[PDB]
Ligand binder design. Structure first.
Ligand SMILES: Nc1nc2c(ncn2[C@@H]2O[C@H](COP(=O)(O)OP(=O)(O)O)[C@@H](O)[C@H]2O)c(=O)[nH]1
Ligand SMILES: [Mg+2]
Length: 199
């Protein structure tokens, strides 16, 4: 049985494109009229059994202001997203985290910089600092290529289940990649995060 996960971040960062990679979750999503939300059931399969994240994706209302308390309430974990091609979206991460922690004081949170498939990257590893003092794990992701798609969910499942060595035994069916994540760029970016972390 299951965990509410709230996916937040500026409009246009790729939240909806990311949750939709999980094809069953997209097929089985439940639209909640009263709340302005689609709830996608993303089941994943660990070496210890299944875990279900019910991922709350907005219906775009973040473009007009903050989300209502009912969106965040009873969340057990979260993903904050920004877009590595837009510094302003990164600049706004602290405010999203504040809103989230205001309603859900002690939950595990992953920070994700999306669209790392785009060659002209504006927010690089050296610049991504917010997660350090706040105890968040960070990953680069590219929703459109499934790059690192399972990373945030695996880190969350380890935190939520209380098993640091949990692994996924099989991947969910994901929408086939719509863009190629350049494998060279992926390897440099993962190492660049490791370097920034040691600096
Ligand atoms: N290149 C690229 N474009 C993306 C990615 N994710 C989303 N997009 C594009 O970014 C725009 C906003 O995506 P959307 O999922 O609607 O963002 P949301 O408003 O945060 O829900 C759309 O044009 C997407 O196709 C990605 O990983 N790579
Ligand atoms: Mg959206």
């Amino acid at each position: 049985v299951q965990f509410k996960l709230v996916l937040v971040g500026d409009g246009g960062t790729g939240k909806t494109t990311f949750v939709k990679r999980h094809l069953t979750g997209e097929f089985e999503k439940k639209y909640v009229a009263t709340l302005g939300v689609e709830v996608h059931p993303l089941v994943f399969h660990t070496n210890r059994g299944p875990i279900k994240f019910n991922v709350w994706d907005t219906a775009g209302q973040e473009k007009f202001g903050g989300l209502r308390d009912g969106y965040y309430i009873q969340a057990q974990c979260a993903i904050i997203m920004f877009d590595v091609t837009s510094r302003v979206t990164y600049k706004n991460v602290p405010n999203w985290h504040r809103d989230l922690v205001r309603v859900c004081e002690n939950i595990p949170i992953v920070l994700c910089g999306n669209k790392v498939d785009i060659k002209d990257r504006k927010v690089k590893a050296k610049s991504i600092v917010f997660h350090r003092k706040k105890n968040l794990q960070y990953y680069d992701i590219s929703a459109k290529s499934n790059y690192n798609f399972e990373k945030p969910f695996l880190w969350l499942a380890r935190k939520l289940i209380g098993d640091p060595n949990l692994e996924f035994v099989a991947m969910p069916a994901l929408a086939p990649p719509e863009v190629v994540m350049d494998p060279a760029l992926a390897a440099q970016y993962e190492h660049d995060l490791e370097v920034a972390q040691t600096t």
